[PDB]
Amino acid sequence: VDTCSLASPASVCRTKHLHLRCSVDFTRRTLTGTAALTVQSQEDNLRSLVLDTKDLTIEKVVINGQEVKYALGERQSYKGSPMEISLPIALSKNQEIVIEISFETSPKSSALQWLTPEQTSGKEHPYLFSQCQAIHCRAILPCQDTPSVKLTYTAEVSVPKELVALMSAIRDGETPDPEDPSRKIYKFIQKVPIPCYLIALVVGALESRQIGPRTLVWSEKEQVEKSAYEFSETESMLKIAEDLGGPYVWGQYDLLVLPPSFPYGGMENPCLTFVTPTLLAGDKSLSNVIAHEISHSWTGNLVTNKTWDHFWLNEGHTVYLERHICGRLFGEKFRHFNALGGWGELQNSVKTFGETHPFTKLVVDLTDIDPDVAYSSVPYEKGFALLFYLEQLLGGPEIFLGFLKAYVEKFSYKSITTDDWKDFLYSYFKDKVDVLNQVDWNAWLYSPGLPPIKPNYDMTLTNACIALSQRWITAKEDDLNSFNATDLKDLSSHQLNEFLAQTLQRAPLPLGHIKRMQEVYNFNAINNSEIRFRWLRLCIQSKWEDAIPLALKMATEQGRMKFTRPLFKDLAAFDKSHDQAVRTYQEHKASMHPVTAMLVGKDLKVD
Ligand SMILES: O=C(c1ccncc1)c1ccc(F)cc1
Ligand SMILES: [Yb+3]
Ligand SMILES: [Yb+3]
Ligand SMILES: [Zn+2]
C-alpha cells in the first residue's frame, strides 16, 4: 500500500503508457494539454479508477471518443486531490483502454519552477524546469503517482520557437507548431518503463556540447564551456558503472546543468541527469555527484523502491555504487575516506533530528508525512553503512559487488520492498546465512539513531584532517600564532572539506580562532561550494558578524537545499543576523523554488 498516493493501487489497475501533448505558456505560467494514459485493468469488472492530481485544472476526460464523468475529491494537503473517473464500459482483467485527460497546471505547481529572464544567465528568455521526485508528478499531470507503477511515455511539447525543450527521454525530432508559427514542437520517446517520478521537462535557451560517445552537456551558453570540462570524466564513470551494474540500457547519458535554484545536487532523470551549477568548482572535485546520478541508472531507475518508505533501497545502493566508481578512479583508500565522511554526515543527521526520531530509521513509515519534510541523509548514509557493514561481513568488495550485479539483474524493471531485498540477499548468500543471522536486522532496518555496529574504515587520508582539526580545537590564544598557510600544503580539496567538517562538528569555536583561520588560510577566497558552505557555517555558528553578508549571499544566490537550508537556519539561530535572515527569506520567497520556499519557511518558523 503506497500511503503517499491517492490513486488506485497497482493491484487494481496499472498505467502502461503516457502520451503527453502539451504547450508551455510562459505568459500564464501554465502547461496545458492532454495526458493520454493507456491503463490496464488488474481486476474483473472494473468500472472506475482514481488518479492523483495536485492543483490541476481538469477540462474534460475522454474515453472511446466521448466525454465521461469524473469527480475531484477534497484536497488532502501535500497529497493533493484524488480524481475518480467513471469508465463507460466495465473492464475485464488485463483489458487495456486509453483515457485522455485535458488539463492545465497551476502557476503554483510544486513540480515546477518558472524563471523570469532576469533569473537566467542570458537575461533575455524565461526558463522552466520540473522536479517530480518524490510525489510532484501529480502537480504536472494526472497519474498514478506511485513508484510501484512503471510506464513508458511519448511526448510532444510546444514552446516558443527561440527556446529548446528537453525531457527524460530520447529526443525524437522537432517541427514548427501547425497551430502557431511562433512556436516549435519537440518530440520525445521513453521506451524503457519508468516510475512517474522520473518524468522531467526543461524549457529554455539551451545549447549543447558533446563530451563523450553517448553524452552531451546542456546549459545556457555562458555555462557550456565550464560544464564540458567539469564533467569530462562522465564516460569513464559510465564505463565503470556498466562493469559493476551490467549494461546501460537507456541509450543516451546526457547532462543538464540547471540555473542555481535547482534544489538538489543532481536528479537521476533517465537519459538526462539534472545537476546543480554549484558543481562547477573548476577542478572536477565535485564529480562524485555525477558518479551518484550515473549509478541510479541501475539502482533506482531499473530497480525501484515500491513505496517511499523504502527510499533507502534507491539511495543506499546508489551511494554504495558511487563510492566504488570513485574507488576505481582514485583508489581504495579514497573510497574509505568518502565512506568515513558519510558516517560523519550520518552522525550529523542523527544529532540534528535526535537519536530517537522516527526519520532516523532506515525504513520509515510515511503515512501522514510529507516526503519532502522527511528527506535527509539518513537513507543515503545509514543505507550505505549497512551495505558497507555487509560487504565486510560477507568477505569483501569483490564478493559484495557480485551480489549487487545479481540484485540489479534480478529486479530490473521492477519495484521492490526492503523484504524483497532481504529475501534475495539471503538467497544469494545461502552459504553465509549463519553470518547473515548475526546481523541485528531489527535495529539496522527499523530502529532510530546511529547503527548498532560501525564498519571498519581505513583512516590514511582522514588522519591529517583530524590532526589539524584537533590542533585548532585544543589551541588556546597563545597557540594561534603557530598556524600558517603551510598547514594546508599537503591537503587536497577533499581533505580541506573534511578538516572543516570535523571542525564544524565541534562548533562554535572561539571567535578569535575563526578570525585567525581566515587570516592564515583565507577560506573566504575559496569558491568550492562544499568548502565554502562549511566554512560559512563555522563562521556563523562561531558568531562572526563579518560572515553574515557572505552567508546571506550564498543562501540566496543559489538554492541547493543542502546549502540554502542550513545557512538560513544558522543565520536565524544567530541573534545578530536573525532579523536579516527572515527579511531576506520574505523578500526572495516568491522567486524561490516552491519546495525550497516551503521548507525554509518551516525551518525559520515563518508564516
Ligand atoms: O520521503 C522521502 C524519504 C523516504 C525515506 N526516508 C527518508 C525520506 C523522500 C524521497 C525522495 C525525495 F525527493 C524526498 C523525500
Ligand atoms: Yb524517430
Ligand atoms: Yb599556552
Ligand atoms: Zn540519489
XYZ file of C-alpha atoms and ligand atoms in Angstrom:
625
model
C 0.000 0.000 0.000
C 1.502 3.331 -1.085
C 0.390 5.746 1.621
C 1.727 8.738 -0.285
C -0.651 8.151 -3.188
C -4.404 8.676 -3.525
C -4.682 6.804 -6.849
C -5.940 3.253 -7.499
C -3.177 0.870 -6.441
C -1.185 -1.322 -8.825
C -3.302 -4.302 -7.737
C -6.428 -2.619 -9.205
C -5.122 -1.096 -12.465
C -1.815 -0.086 -13.909
C -0.732 2.599 -16.303
C 1.303 1.110 -19.145
C 1.950 4.250 -21.213
C 1.539 8.016 -21.156
C 1.284 10.057 -24.260
C 1.660 13.740 -23.351
C 0.754 16.565 -25.737
C 1.243 19.929 -24.118
C 2.154 23.548 -24.666
C 4.289 25.653 -22.275
C 2.710 29.087 -21.663
C 5.236 31.420 -20.042
C 2.773 34.347 -20.069
C 0.376 32.467 -17.778
C 2.972 30.129 -16.251
C 0.926 27.068 -17.199
C 1.424 23.810 -19.011
C -1.798 22.999 -20.931
C -2.690 19.867 -22.834
C -3.661 16.231 -22.782
C -2.302 13.204 -20.968
C -3.444 10.032 -22.683
C -2.967 7.151 -20.250
C -3.081 3.579 -21.525
C -4.407 1.779 -18.469
C -4.571 -1.964 -17.878
C -7.227 -3.405 -15.537
C -5.901 -5.909 -12.986
C -9.425 -6.711 -11.798
C -12.563 -8.256 -13.177
C -15.469 -5.894 -13.807
C -13.574 -2.683 -13.219
C -15.881 0.339 -13.530
C -13.874 3.225 -12.157
C -10.434 4.304 -11.177
C -8.714 7.030 -9.230
C -5.746 9.199 -10.253
C -3.550 11.573 -8.237
C -3.709 15.301 -9.013
C -2.490 18.468 -7.286
C -3.560 21.995 -8.228
C -4.547 20.769 -11.707
C -7.485 22.225 -13.638
C -9.395 19.462 -15.425
C -11.341 20.434 -18.515
C -12.583 17.018 -19.625
C -11.899 13.286 -19.647
C -12.451 11.418 -22.923
C -12.681 7.629 -23.453
C -13.699 5.971 -26.759
C -14.129 9.432 -28.269
C -16.763 10.525 -25.728
C -16.655 12.607 -22.513
C -17.076 10.666 -19.323
C -17.956 11.557 -15.760
C -15.182 12.248 -13.235
C -15.044 13.928 -9.809
C -12.306 15.616 -7.815
C -12.258 14.906 -4.101
C -11.284 17.266 -1.287
C -7.603 18.254 -1.140
C -5.512 16.173 1.257
C -2.814 18.731 1.973
C 0.512 17.795 0.267
C -1.029 14.666 -1.362
C -3.320 16.806 -3.481
C -6.766 15.814 -4.673
C -7.948 12.404 -5.880
C -9.645 12.194 -9.275
C -12.216 9.425 -9.764
C -13.132 8.589 -13.360
C -16.269 6.629 -14.242
C -15.444 4.197 -17.042
C -18.118 3.927 -19.776
C -17.773 0.087 -20.050
C -16.732 -2.407 -17.337
C -13.259 -3.879 -17.955
C -12.171 -7.478 -17.607
C -8.805 -8.381 -16.118
C -5.920 -7.421 -18.401
C -8.092 -5.344 -20.729
C -6.443 -2.049 -21.724
C -8.111 1.250 -22.515
C -6.860 4.733 -23.330
C -8.054 7.597 -21.128
C -7.428 11.116 -22.499
C -7.407 13.841 -19.815
C -7.408 17.541 -20.830
C -5.743 19.566 -18.075
C -3.878 22.736 -17.124
C -1.279 23.188 -14.323
C -1.301 25.963 -11.684
C 1.417 28.640 -11.588
C 1.920 27.384 -8.056
C 2.619 23.782 -9.185
C 5.077 22.258 -6.676
C 6.702 20.302 -9.522
C 7.728 23.388 -11.476
C 9.863 26.466 -11.202
C 9.142 29.265 -13.665
C 12.037 31.708 -14.050
C 11.891 35.235 -15.486
C 14.641 36.301 -17.938
C 16.461 38.116 -15.118
C 16.779 34.843 -13.118
C 18.637 33.183 -16.012
C 22.208 33.585 -17.346
C 21.283 35.147 -20.728
C 18.781 37.679 -19.354
C 16.646 37.581 -22.499
C 14.473 34.474 -22.209
C 12.479 32.768 -19.499
C 13.171 29.191 -18.329
C 11.122 26.353 -16.902
C 12.215 23.194 -15.129
C 10.470 20.343 -13.334
C 11.340 18.189 -10.345
C 8.923 15.294 -9.680
C 10.596 13.200 -7.005
C 9.004 12.119 -4.708
C 5.337 12.957 -5.329
C 5.180 16.041 -7.516
C 4.348 14.369 -10.816
C 0.626 14.797 -9.805
C 1.288 18.537 -9.823
C 2.117 18.316 -13.533
C -0.395 15.784 -14.888
C -2.997 13.325 -13.587
C -1.318 9.935 -12.971
C -0.917 7.035 -10.582
C 1.797 8.887 -8.693
C 3.498 5.941 -7.050
C 6.799 4.253 -7.924
C 5.039 0.870 -7.725
C 3.801 1.506 -11.307
C 6.181 1.698 -14.318
C 5.174 3.049 -17.681
C 6.677 4.082 -20.980
C 5.995 7.512 -22.432
C 5.993 9.679 -25.534
C 5.519 13.466 -25.549
C 5.060 16.386 -27.942
C 5.846 19.742 -26.298
C 5.055 23.152 -27.866
C 7.362 26.018 -26.827
C 8.270 29.481 -28.134
C 10.477 28.699 -31.131
C 13.536 30.518 -29.769
C 13.610 28.035 -26.860
C 14.519 24.314 -26.502
C 12.511 21.632 -24.694
C 14.234 18.522 -23.254
C 12.814 15.594 -21.273
C 13.904 12.361 -19.547
C 13.706 10.505 -22.875
C 15.277 10.197 -26.300
C 14.830 13.284 -28.496
C 12.685 12.341 -31.425
C 12.807 15.477 -33.602
C 11.316 18.975 -33.758
C 8.816 20.821 -36.029
C 7.155 24.201 -36.305
C 3.816 24.199 -34.459
C 0.965 23.943 -37.045
C -1.347 25.824 -34.650
C 1.177 28.663 -34.044
C 4.250 29.517 -36.212
C 5.887 31.467 -33.348
C 6.284 28.016 -31.730
C 8.152 24.751 -32.063
C 7.011 21.247 -31.148
C 9.649 18.938 -29.644
C 9.038 15.212 -29.534
C 10.379 12.547 -27.139
C 10.218 8.826 -26.541
C 10.991 6.866 -23.381
C 10.863 3.168 -24.422
C 12.027 1.829 -21.025
C 9.300 1.515 -18.313
C 9.875 4.094 -15.550
C 8.092 5.198 -12.388
C 6.408 8.574 -12.976
C 8.714 10.422 -10.512
C 11.313 10.156 -13.310
C 9.302 12.245 -15.815
C 11.199 15.541 -16.264
C 10.910 18.623 -18.512
C 13.099 21.691 -19.078
C 12.396 24.583 -21.425
C 14.926 27.395 -22.040
C 17.653 28.871 -24.213
C 19.834 25.762 -24.116
C 22.972 24.865 -26.057
C 24.772 21.543 -26.072
C 28.267 20.335 -26.406
C 29.372 16.771 -26.895
C 31.692 15.347 -24.188
C 31.628 11.618 -24.819
C 30.349 8.988 -27.221
C 26.908 8.989 -25.570
C 26.847 12.272 -23.649
C 26.053 15.863 -24.452
C 26.113 18.566 -21.787
C 23.233 21.083 -21.973
C 23.024 24.517 -20.330
C 22.689 28.171 -21.216
C 25.538 29.337 -23.424
C 27.520 31.014 -20.653
C 27.984 27.671 -18.796
C 28.666 25.308 -21.658
C 32.494 25.522 -21.753
C 32.830 25.262 -17.979
C 30.387 22.323 -17.734
C 32.059 20.342 -20.512
C 35.357 20.471 -18.626
C 33.858 19.915 -15.216
C 32.067 16.737 -16.316
C 34.704 15.355 -18.697
C 35.132 12.140 -16.604
C 31.492 11.205 -17.354
C 32.158 8.497 -19.993
C 34.887 6.869 -17.904
C 32.435 6.724 -14.959
C 29.744 5.192 -17.178
C 32.158 2.515 -18.369
C 32.975 1.646 -14.734
C 29.247 1.686 -13.703
C 28.486 -0.728 -16.587
C 31.199 -3.037 -15.379
C 29.658 -3.026 -11.873
C 25.970 -2.962 -12.715
C 25.549 -4.565 -16.132
C 24.615 -2.921 -19.482
C 23.490 0.691 -19.577
C 20.002 0.263 -21.095
C 18.913 3.880 -21.570
C 20.723 4.808 -24.806
C 21.894 8.354 -24.128
C 23.505 9.689 -20.939
C 23.158 13.489 -21.186
C 23.743 16.138 -18.529
C 21.710 19.263 -17.993
C 23.214 21.987 -15.800
C 20.281 23.953 -14.315
C 20.044 27.520 -13.022
C 21.248 27.967 -9.430
C 17.836 27.444 -7.795
C 17.710 23.747 -8.683
C 17.012 22.144 -5.240
C 19.301 19.083 -5.327
C 22.900 18.292 -6.261
C 21.546 16.068 -9.026
C 18.409 14.222 -10.144
C 18.716 10.924 -11.990
C 16.118 11.622 -14.742
C 16.633 8.901 -17.364
C 18.642 9.912 -20.443
C 19.102 13.413 -18.980
C 20.614 13.814 -15.496
C 19.848 17.252 -13.982
C 22.666 18.882 -11.957
C 23.236 21.998 -9.839
C 25.595 24.665 -11.171
C 27.173 24.533 -7.675
C 29.174 21.529 -9.038
C 31.223 23.861 -11.237
C 34.234 24.125 -8.913
C 36.655 24.396 -11.860
C 38.701 21.326 -10.959
C 36.266 18.369 -11.294
C 36.405 17.895 -7.483
C 32.605 17.535 -7.025
C 32.211 14.792 -9.644
C 31.055 12.198 -7.103
C 27.562 13.710 -7.684
C 27.857 12.592 -11.364
C 29.014 9.135 -10.215
C 25.914 9.036 -7.995
C 23.470 10.104 -10.724
C 25.085 7.650 -13.154
C 24.689 4.794 -10.610
C 20.939 5.482 -10.315
C 20.696 4.263 -13.940
C 20.778 0.878 -12.197
C 19.780 1.384 -8.592
C 16.630 3.439 -8.582
C 15.749 3.641 -12.288
C 15.956 -0.094 -13.070
C 15.388 -1.499 -9.605
C 12.922 0.895 -7.978
C 11.519 1.403 -4.424
C 7.900 0.218 -4.326
C 6.874 2.983 -1.946
C 8.760 5.915 -0.447
C 9.083 4.035 2.888
C 11.767 2.036 1.075
C 13.710 5.033 -0.294
C 16.919 3.726 1.263
C 16.927 0.926 -1.368
C 17.263 3.616 -4.031
C 19.861 5.744 -2.246
C 21.892 3.381 -0.086
C 22.714 1.195 -3.084
C 23.435 4.215 -5.296
C 25.870 5.683 -2.715
C 27.445 2.216 -2.467
C 27.984 2.120 -6.248
C 29.005 5.810 -6.366
C 31.806 5.116 -3.869
C 33.009 2.132 -5.920
C 33.214 4.278 -9.059
C 35.308 6.769 -7.077
C 37.493 3.955 -5.641
C 38.154 2.611 -9.135
C 39.112 6.039 -10.409
C 41.088 7.206 -7.396
C 41.873 4.198 -5.235
C 40.563 2.153 -2.362
C 41.943 4.493 0.336
C 39.835 7.232 -1.280
C 36.629 5.058 -1.177
C 37.308 4.595 2.537
C 37.836 8.361 3.067
C 34.464 9.046 1.413
C 32.773 6.261 3.344
C 34.102 7.565 6.665
C 32.942 11.055 5.691
C 29.446 9.704 5.059
C 29.446 8.204 8.568
C 30.215 11.726 9.835
C 27.246 13.087 7.844
C 25.076 10.346 9.398
C 26.252 11.393 12.888
C 25.247 14.954 11.992
C 21.764 13.915 10.831
C 21.015 11.825 13.890
C 22.198 14.657 16.141
C 20.047 17.183 14.286
C 16.857 15.074 14.369
C 17.552 13.464 17.722
C 18.595 9.893 18.280
C 15.045 8.549 18.869
C 13.480 10.434 15.951
C 11.442 8.333 13.502
C 13.157 9.954 10.432
C 16.461 8.410 11.629
C 15.042 4.954 10.974
C 16.251 3.272 7.799
C 12.754 2.143 6.803
C 10.371 4.962 7.555
C 6.600 4.995 7.849
C 5.455 7.923 5.681
C 1.722 7.597 6.432
C 0.942 11.175 7.190
C 4.328 12.641 6.497
C 5.221 14.810 3.510
C 8.199 13.036 1.884
C 9.883 16.460 1.399
C 9.801 17.062 5.167
C 11.226 13.607 5.934
C 14.042 13.908 3.333
C 17.602 13.771 4.744
C 20.999 11.992 4.559
C 19.718 9.110 6.630
C 18.555 6.831 3.798
C 21.793 7.655 1.925
C 24.265 7.085 4.746
C 22.537 4.639 7.041
C 21.738 2.677 3.879
C 25.366 2.936 2.725
C 26.619 1.977 6.192
C 24.504 -1.217 6.150
C 25.817 -2.297 2.763
C 29.440 -1.496 3.745
C 28.965 -3.469 7.010
C 27.545 -6.378 4.970
C 30.426 -6.157 2.467
C 32.889 -6.543 5.338
C 30.865 -9.301 6.966
C 30.492 -11.310 3.778
C 34.057 -11.394 2.505
C 34.824 -8.069 0.866
C 34.013 -5.705 -2.061
C 34.551 -8.261 -4.844
C 32.055 -10.672 -3.283
C 29.531 -7.960 -2.414
C 29.699 -6.426 -5.937
C 28.779 -9.916 -7.282
C 25.629 -9.654 -5.144
C 24.882 -6.105 -6.337
C 25.090 -7.098 -10.021
C 22.866 -10.124 -9.401
C 20.411 -7.907 -7.485
C 20.117 -5.409 -10.314
C 19.609 -8.247 -12.831
C 17.018 -9.960 -10.608
C 14.829 -6.902 -10.060
C 15.373 -4.909 -13.254
C 12.196 -3.152 -14.412
C 10.528 -3.973 -11.084
C 9.555 -2.098 -7.917
C 10.561 -3.771 -4.649
C 10.468 -3.531 -0.860
C 13.033 -3.962 1.858
C 11.755 -7.515 2.434
C 12.284 -8.343 -1.270
C 15.845 -7.112 -0.977
C 16.489 -9.054 2.275
C 14.995 -12.215 0.814
C 17.253 -12.063 -2.234
C 20.290 -11.195 -0.034
C 19.678 -14.435 1.918
C 19.077 -16.426 -1.277
C 22.317 -15.098 -2.889
C 24.343 -15.676 0.268
C 22.770 -19.073 1.071
C 26.195 -20.417 2.145
C 26.715 -17.479 4.551
C 23.345 -17.492 6.281
C 24.875 -18.028 9.749
C 26.797 -14.785 9.144
C 23.626 -13.011 7.941
C 21.832 -14.190 11.070
C 24.426 -12.386 13.196
C 23.042 -9.060 11.843
C 20.688 -7.114 14.101
C 18.115 -6.675 11.304
C 15.520 -5.086 13.551
C 17.947 -2.420 14.747
C 19.510 -1.736 11.311
C 16.167 -1.549 9.479
C 13.626 -0.254 11.989
C 15.360 1.414 14.968
C 16.191 5.121 15.229
C 19.636 6.626 15.910
C 23.102 5.509 14.822
C 23.523 1.939 13.550
C 24.309 -0.730 16.171
C 27.658 -1.512 14.542
C 30.108 0.907 12.891
C 32.018 -0.554 9.949
C 35.824 -0.648 9.695
C 37.329 2.334 7.864
C 40.838 2.827 6.559
C 41.990 6.143 8.030
C 45.009 7.050 5.908
C 43.548 10.110 4.198
C 41.420 11.190 7.152
C 44.278 11.329 9.703
C 45.738 14.662 8.555
C 42.254 16.267 8.649
C 41.549 15.046 12.158
C 45.007 16.099 13.302
C 44.623 19.663 12.035
C 41.016 19.948 13.313
C 42.198 18.818 16.777
C 45.098 21.288 16.755
C 42.545 24.061 16.227
C 40.027 22.848 18.782
C 42.636 22.405 21.540
C 44.505 25.625 20.622
C 44.482 28.481 23.151
C 45.065 32.109 22.305
C 48.849 31.765 22.655
C 48.800 28.889 20.137
C 47.149 30.811 17.273
C 50.486 32.196 16.046
C 51.749 28.663 15.189
C 49.135 28.196 12.460
C 50.224 29.179 8.911
C 49.198 28.627 5.280
C 51.685 25.720 5.079
C 49.380 23.674 7.338
C 47.266 23.128 4.181
C 50.230 22.259 1.944
C 49.548 18.582 1.512
C 45.752 18.626 1.717
C 43.524 18.021 -1.284
C 40.257 19.956 -1.616
C 38.554 16.821 -0.270
C 40.740 16.945 2.822
C 40.166 20.713 3.310
C 36.474 19.966 3.203
C 36.867 17.144 5.704
C 39.038 19.246 8.049
C 36.168 21.799 8.099
C 33.521 19.097 8.559
C 35.467 17.741 11.574
C 35.819 21.264 12.991
C 32.152 22.091 12.338
C 31.151 19.024 14.441
C 32.615 20.906 17.456
C 31.312 24.372 16.635
C 31.289 27.004 17.938
C 34.980 27.721 18.176
C 36.141 30.923 19.867
C 35.756 33.919 17.565
C 39.468 34.742 17.724
C 40.224 31.221 16.393
C 37.925 31.680 13.408
C 39.411 35.116 12.711
C 42.897 33.550 12.793
C 41.743 30.787 10.433
C 40.717 33.428 7.908
C 43.994 35.303 8.472
C 46.212 32.318 7.671
C 44.160 30.122 5.348
C 41.994 32.740 3.519
C 38.991 30.405 3.349
C 36.899 33.440 2.227
C 38.587 33.145 -1.197
C 37.562 29.546 -1.880
C 34.635 29.170 -4.274
C 34.253 25.368 -3.990
C 30.625 25.307 -2.810
C 31.170 22.362 -0.397
C 34.125 24.048 1.342
C 32.555 27.494 1.289
C 29.301 26.143 2.749
C 31.059 24.502 5.775
C 33.369 27.476 6.344
C 30.443 29.964 6.401
C 28.512 27.664 8.725
C 31.558 27.518 11.012
C 31.849 31.342 10.912
C 28.167 31.960 11.706
C 27.861 29.364 14.464
C 31.054 30.850 15.995
C 29.280 34.262 15.830
C 31.457 36.166 13.360
C 29.383 39.130 12.160
C 31.632 39.738 9.136
C 30.458 36.373 7.760
C 26.778 37.396 7.846
C 26.627 39.050 4.383
C 28.720 36.218 2.834
C 26.335 33.672 4.316
C 23.223 35.620 3.278
C 24.641 35.877 -0.245
C 25.414 32.162 -0.638
C 21.991 31.253 0.855
C 20.153 33.282 -1.795
C 22.411 33.240 -4.869
C 21.890 29.502 -5.250
C 19.117 27.294 -3.903
C 20.540 23.801 -3.475
C 18.689 22.770 -0.335
C 21.806 21.092 1.131
C 23.323 24.559 1.400
C 20.384 27.031 1.482
C 18.529 25.319 4.340
C 21.332 25.022 6.900
C 22.641 28.532 6.054
C 19.252 30.167 6.705
C 18.864 28.029 9.860
C 22.306 29.144 11.103
C 21.632 32.833 10.267
C 18.295 32.541 12.082
C 19.942 30.941 15.169
C 22.492 33.811 15.404
C 20.869 36.782 17.206
C 22.845 39.341 15.169
C 21.565 38.014 11.830
C 18.130 36.616 12.796
C 16.095 39.616 11.564
C 18.016 39.882 8.272
C 17.567 36.137 7.710
C 13.794 36.262 7.955
C 13.611 39.512 5.994
C 15.819 38.022 3.286
C 13.659 34.928 3.120
C 10.495 37.093 2.930
C 11.983 39.074 0.011
C 13.130 36.045 -2.014
C 10.268 33.676 -1.187
C 8.150 34.441 -4.306
C 11.053 33.854 -6.642
C 12.323 30.683 -4.901
C 11.672 27.086 -5.879
C 8.307 26.222 -4.355
C 9.535 23.258 -2.376
C 12.623 25.097 -1.152
C 10.418 28.061 -0.145
C 8.125 25.790 1.838
C 10.971 24.035 3.713
C 12.943 27.203 4.524
C 9.687 28.754 5.781
C 9.133 25.793 8.100
C 12.766 25.845 9.268
C 12.520 29.619 10.044
C 9.063 29.119 11.603
C 7.735 31.878 9.440
C 4.159 32.322 8.275
O 10.178 10.714 1.672
C 11.348 10.536 1.404
C 12.112 9.690 2.414
C 11.923 8.313 2.486
C 12.596 7.546 3.439
N 13.415 8.121 4.321
C 13.596 9.446 4.303
C 12.948 10.254 3.370
C 11.809 11.236 0.140
C 12.188 10.615 -1.041
C 12.566 11.398 -2.143
C 12.540 12.796 -2.100
F 12.902 13.571 -3.144
C 12.129 13.407 -0.939
C 11.766 12.618 0.146
Yb 12.400 8.807 -34.675
Yb 49.602 28.030 26.169
Zn 20.351 9.536 -5.178
